[PDB]
Amino acid sequence: PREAAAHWVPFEDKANMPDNVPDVVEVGATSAPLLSASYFIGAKCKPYNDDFMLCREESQGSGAIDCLKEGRRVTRCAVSVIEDINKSCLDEFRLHWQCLEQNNHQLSGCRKAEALLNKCVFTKLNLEKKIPGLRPDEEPVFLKKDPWIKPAVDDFKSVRAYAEAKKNGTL
Amino acid sequence: MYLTYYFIEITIFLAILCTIFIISAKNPMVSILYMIALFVIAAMYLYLIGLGIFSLLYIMIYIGAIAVLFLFIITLLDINGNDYNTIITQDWFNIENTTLLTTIGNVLLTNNAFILLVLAIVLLLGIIGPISITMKHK
Amino acid sequence: AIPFEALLPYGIIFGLLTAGGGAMQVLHVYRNGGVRDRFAIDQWDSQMMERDLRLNGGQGRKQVDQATAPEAFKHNHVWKSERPLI
Amino acid sequence: MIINIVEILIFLVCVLFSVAYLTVAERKTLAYMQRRLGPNFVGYYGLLQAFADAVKLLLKEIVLPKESNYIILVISPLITLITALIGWVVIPLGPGITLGELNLGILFSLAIGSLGVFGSLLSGWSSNSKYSLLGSIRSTAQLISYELILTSIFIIIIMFVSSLNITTIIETQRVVWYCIPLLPLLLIFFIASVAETARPPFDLTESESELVAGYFTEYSGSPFVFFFLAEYSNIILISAFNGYLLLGGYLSFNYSYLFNILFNDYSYVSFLFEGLINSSAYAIKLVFLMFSFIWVRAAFPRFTYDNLINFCWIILLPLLFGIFLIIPSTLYIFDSFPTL
Amino acid sequence: TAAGISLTGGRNRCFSEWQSFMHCTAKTDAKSRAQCLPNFEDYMECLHHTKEKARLREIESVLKQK
Amino acid sequence: RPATWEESEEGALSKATKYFLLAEMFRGLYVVLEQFFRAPYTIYYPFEKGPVSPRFR
Amino acid sequence: MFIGTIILVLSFLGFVFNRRNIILAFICLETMLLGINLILLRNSVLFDDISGSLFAIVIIILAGVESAIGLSLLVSYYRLRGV
Amino acid sequence: MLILAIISLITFVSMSKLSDNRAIIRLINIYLILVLVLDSFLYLLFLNNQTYTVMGELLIFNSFTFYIDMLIYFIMIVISSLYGYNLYNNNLYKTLFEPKKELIILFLINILGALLIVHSNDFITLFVAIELQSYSIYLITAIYNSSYKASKASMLYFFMGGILSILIAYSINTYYSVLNSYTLHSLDSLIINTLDLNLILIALSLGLLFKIGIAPLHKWLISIYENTPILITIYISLIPKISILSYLVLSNISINSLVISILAILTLLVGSVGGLLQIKIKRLLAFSGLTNAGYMMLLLLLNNNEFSYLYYITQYSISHLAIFMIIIFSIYYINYINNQYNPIIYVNQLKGLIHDNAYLVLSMAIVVFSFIGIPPLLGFFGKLNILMSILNNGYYFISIVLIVASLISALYYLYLLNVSIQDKNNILINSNETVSSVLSYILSSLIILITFGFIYNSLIIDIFNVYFN
Amino acid sequence: MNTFIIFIILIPIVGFALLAVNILLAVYKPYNEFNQTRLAFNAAFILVAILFLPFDLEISTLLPYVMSIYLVSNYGFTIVLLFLLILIIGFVYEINTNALKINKHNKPNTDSLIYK
Amino acid sequence: SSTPLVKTSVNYSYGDYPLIDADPHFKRVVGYMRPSDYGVIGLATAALPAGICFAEWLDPVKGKFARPSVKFLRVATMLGFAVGFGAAYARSSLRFFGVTENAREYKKDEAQMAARKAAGLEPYGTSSLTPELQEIAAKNSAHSIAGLFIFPWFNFVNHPYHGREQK
Amino acid sequence: INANPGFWNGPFRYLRWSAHNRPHLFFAFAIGIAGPVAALTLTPLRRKYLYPDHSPLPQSYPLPQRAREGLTGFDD
């Protein structure tokens, strides 16, 4: 919760998870894939993560030491989601963060690559991006048409993929 | 990269060096010429401690107004065992870079807005006073 | 038409800033290795990119997509030793 | 380590090598503004002459007046020069391409311009003649007084941004510029821009007629190239500020429609061409602006100092507080509050 | 006020130690504040870590000794 | 008798449009811009010479 | 904690023994207003808040207005004299 | 309604000429009167010392501070009423006591500064307000600029004000360096047991106190209080007293202070003996101003002293206020006037005041009896109730050095009367003009308060018992 | 190692390479080559910089507001607008007192030819 | 946007009378003040010009009994409205504290609260704020009628909690 | 000459007069007075006529208030 030093030195410890906690399948996803699939792991693993922050709340002082069962719980289901999308829409999902690896991860960059993915995951993995807190008669901003902030350079692959989504009638 | 370690202990001594030249100066303006360097060493110490914000705040206001103000006046004369590396974690609770400056702008405006409101009268007094003195109306 | 001799040093400066911007594109992409720059360092993003360097192995922003972790991922993770601040 | 020391050299020959031909360009302009030819004897089309200026100027002597502390006459040229040269970090040159990106851009951008007064006040104190001192007084008082409004519109710019990073402003500015909604802001900024530079719509203080042959110090030599180059660095530095936070910074149009026609994939050619066109939009705005400074330098006489302080505090600055009352209010009418 | 604020406007290092102290005071009248003392001392260890520094210099002296 | 504020034919808004928006400033600015796009006069003296009368001395 | 203490204390010792130069008193006082900062700012730093920074921005401002007021007091002190 | 006055009136003064300077002050006089009269009922805002913390843990409004909050308006009505009214309609009294343009602005700025101390919970509001009133007194000293002693005293006040600025700020910094608060709930008789917050709160106290004339820092305020003009001193020897002393008595941050007790002894001693060999009246009067703040240091030591404080405040801010106005009247009858800014200096000059009138003398005599505790006066019961608080908590040697201080004080207070009733050889028989009526009527009011103030001795005790507890 | 810190350090050395190049390249360094009583002023010289400090200072006072302006929705608006509306009348004190008027004693002798 | 989520005293009186509110909203204070209260405003507005005419009748400025300028009368009228309005707000909002006579307004706030319960909207109305800002702005406006001598401060907030029984 | 009629003799005439003689004051002052007056009156209208506000942005992880039910899945 604090920025680093004048001259901080990094350090690590070659030790292990000692006795009781079994090993987990720890998320080996870099920022751009998990940022892309953030809505879907928030959609499927909603009450699990909600339980996580609830249990971290009620464990005042215990905190970190209490909910190890739950840190085991909430990561694994997200790993299940990303493995299912590794099997599901790996071309288009990868393409979404092939676009999103530029633009400083600004989500404003890759609308045309995004809407191709929204049909795909809702087809096979049958999940959906939903923005909570958005009261009705208010357009969700990745659903709207003619945005004000149009991005800098759309990638060359997903624009052709978008045209082919129109020609195949998948859109 | 062990030369990196003593950075802070550089600028402390360079501070101690500088202040001696404040209180040992022939001319008046030579003293403030050392003093602006003391402000700069201070701002580098603020950048080195981890407040890059206030380093430049001071350059805007100390060697911005008040030093240059002192220069402007002094022109107008006629004739001359705590050695423990603290451990820093990483938590993911923050969501947006509400930096130090944002939260100043929140506490000055919500929690303690009355201080800024009376500070308006202090800045009022800064206007009235020099006009209260240096004018001789009619 | 126009006096070209007047615009000729302006043509120079218009070329000089252009060549500067071209080289300042190329060097930054060559540092990044294929992607653009990052015009906004967030604290969220700073911890994130530390994690990403920690994940990919060696490289800066290789940005890999993997199901699970490597075995060194349980061991590569570091803390930061801030100095005593005297 | 290797690719950054070339990253700073290419920027040096992009800027320091350009600011000389700026001083050639001003002569070419004022030639055709007053219906005569520019320098033509010196180079091929009369280019290069700033080299012949400097190399001669580096060969003249270091005659020093007896009333001046010589160290002070070393410090003020050097610090004015390096002030207007370390103002060159977070000029943006395309998206996020600065020398060092840091999230507090404007604060550095503005504190170094705040340091810009500190050399010119210090300079007239050496050679302590009474006219030589009081000229420094008259210069520094306007040099702070419009440094106010120069500073003071930078906050209403970021009432649309709410972020101190400079390259964030242009990506905010993609939907629309800031000059085209806020037009009289540009006019008062343009006169505030030529104020903080020594420009003679406003620089009365370089009156050789008033002083005993005094412009500032007549201190010449390789001292003379220092304040001189600092002045012309200050020119296109404040032009750069005008470029990003008021005008289209590196933006020209959408140009994605063009790109998907041209390329099929990302490649170093594509980065090359996009960085070219972003730098060229920045260049064309910057190069029209450096011309506009001369275009107002020609057509107008100088001021009275009474006119100059009346021009600051009475006619410009209450209108600036009127801006401070209308733009938070226009922000308040709609929801419209900007987030980082 | 700026009571339990942080750099990023969240909660500081010892907010919990502060609030567990304030929970210690809101349920407690004077002449019974003595039981509040270990809640207070837990706060003070946040600020200056005097018990922690005393813990660490001893084990550092043992590590120096061997 | 010279005209006052109220013996003036134009509106205060119209007068102050010329005040703030600087009509006669941009007017002369347009003048010198027009002279930018015209011919100079000067001659290349070691290559061209000015007028010489027969009664020059 | 060393640097703000030492700037403050050396400014204090400079204020005491250097009366008869009067501007030196001002600038030692100004460095005192810097030294209180250099202790307080790092207390904000070490204590994970901006509450000390809240007091710090105010004492920056008050150091400013001090330099605004008292230097006009100086100009009043020298108008009635000559030198 | 201070700010609601100020923001209108500085626009009003800026839109005004120079001859309106009396009339603006007449307006502000009547204004503050009607602020007091029409809004007095806010003492009803509590019944059992019910204390409000307003603007979010920042200000503190209570049973106690409402009194001082009324008191400052009451004295400002008098100070304003000096300016706005002529003394006489003479040439002399218009080249004397003519206010500047910006003066009445600086007063309400100072009253804002004084009230935001006494109502302050936070140290930050404390620091802002002490800077505010310090800048106020900087200007209000320096405003009568064309006097050499005035500017010299302004600089002299300035540098000690800067030291106490940085010293109070260093105390706040140190208290923050050991604790993450700035308020004063964090004391609550528990941290005092287990943490050495003695020396830090002591250093807070000393820095707050040395803006008074506390006897280590002794000569410099006295040099001010004579080098000021005779008018400004009657304001600036009062407001910095009762502002910060009401703060320090409101929060008893140093209880059984070893330091404050010794400084209280030394304060009383050197003030009493410093009043002795002096012929300059502004000196003598300022040393009276010292020793009475000497008694204030005693009231700082105690626990739960809201009676003896407030009663001695309303004693002192009447008596000390009124004796100036008496010698402001007395300069008409004297035979030698120097120094346009400061007409009387030497106490010799009012040699024959009783053969001018008996009644200004009698009014002077009872107020100088009021400083020495003469029992049928209001000035007495102050010292009486001080001592009822002193031996309440066993400051025995403090009580006997109070007696020594009272006797050595009362020696030099009578020196005024030694001068005042003697022979003059050149007596008045007929003055043309009279003194402006309601200006003198204020002094008549302020003196019947002191004489007949033991009448409401009972009712003020009942109001004390009901409201303040 | 970052080019940002290289930039502010290299430029004084570039200035030294431009500084000592004259001392290397010049020659004939220094050959042989009343101010009794007055200095003159108005308040319009001395006052501009002194009055400049609160108006410079208020920009840095207003500066933490503009970063955080989304958080203080519809209320920090109200606070800051009260702050400004104090400072603006503080400004229009001086313009009605004409604090920067530097007026001339070149009066055309208003008083007429009253004769005999 | 209506949960207080702070621990507020409930019906904690300030005098012998029942309260209504800890800070009445500024529109409400106008909406409940007695007709005798408006007389305090009017007599305060008349007091200042009569005060200056008084004060010059007592002792004139330049020895002549002369009425002052109309400029002084207009500005005294302004400040008289200031004093009258401060007195009006001060005398009115005590009755919400239960510290002076609370007879008709306790009836009217058994009406208008019940009038908007049946109307189905919020008992105080929606402010345009996140609830944390509602808390902090009400912490600013809490008890701020005290210290009316120093500065006027008011309740423009319309936050949820008011020291009511439950809502 | 354009000396003064006075604000307190005829207002609207004096407003016209200042607009003819000192627009540096009055056209800063008009922009200044148009701020808060429009800020007071227009904001009820926009919620009534144009469009209502936005949903508030969350500032942390939003915590609901529930009782930690039995949640199965991913034991091993």
mmCIF file of C-alpha atoms in Angstrom, chain A residues 98-99 102 108 112 148-157 159-160, chain D residues 171 174-175 254-256 259-266 270-271 274:
data_model
loop_
_atom_site.group_PDB
_atom_site.id
_atom_site.type_symbol
_atom_site.label_atom_id
_atom_site.label_comp_id
_atom_site.label_asym_id
_atom_site.label_seq_id
_atom_site.Cartn_x
_atom_site.Cartn_y
_atom_site.Cartn_z
ATOM 1 C CA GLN A 98 -3.199 -8.843 -29.294
ATOM 2 C CA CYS A 99 -4.963 -5.547 -29.823
ATOM 3 C CA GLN A 102 -0.897 -1.883 -27.333
ATOM 4 C CA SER A 108 -10.913 2.298 -25.362
ATOM 5 C CA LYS A 112 -14.230 -4.044 -32.820
ATOM 6 C CA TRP A 148 -16.960 9.793 -29.059
ATOM 7 C CA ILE A 149 -13.489 8.493 -28.234
ATOM 8 C CA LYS A 150 -12.635 6.456 -31.268
ATOM 9 C CA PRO A 151 -9.305 4.660 -30.816
ATOM 10 C CA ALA A 152 -5.973 5.486 -32.411
ATOM 11 C CA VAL A 153 -5.203 2.537 -34.695
ATOM 12 C CA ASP A 154 -7.334 -0.572 -34.714
ATOM 13 C CA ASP A 155 -5.249 -3.654 -35.340
ATOM 14 C CA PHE A 156 -5.156 -4.980 -38.849
ATOM 15 C CA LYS A 157 -6.183 -8.526 -38.024
ATOM 16 C CA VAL A 159 -10.813 -5.463 -38.461
ATOM 17 C CA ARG A 160 -10.636 -8.099 -41.182
ATOM 18 C CA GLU D 171 -5.639 11.444 -25.642
ATOM 19 C CA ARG D 174 -8.845 13.308 -29.392
ATOM 20 C CA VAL D 175 -12.596 13.937 -29.339
ATOM 21 C CA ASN D 254 -8.498 9.711 -37.283
ATOM 22 C CA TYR D 255 -6.052 8.127 -39.826
ATOM 23 C CA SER D 256 -7.019 4.540 -38.946
ATOM 24 C CA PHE D 259 -3.957 2.645 -42.268
ATOM 25 C CA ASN D 260 -6.227 -0.361 -42.722
ATOM 26 C CA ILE D 261 -6.128 0.521 -46.403
ATOM 27 C CA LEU D 262 -2.335 0.657 -46.384
ATOM 28 C CA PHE D 263 -0.862 -1.981 -44.086
ATOM 29 C CA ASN D 264 -1.889 -5.560 -43.380
ATOM 30 C CA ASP D 265 -0.066 -6.018 -40.060
ATOM 31 C CA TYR D 266 2.071 -4.249 -37.499
ATOM 32 C CA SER D 270 4.009 1.028 -39.606
ATOM 33 C CA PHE D 271 5.428 2.412 -36.374
ATOM 34 C CA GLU D 274 2.611 6.638 -37.603
#
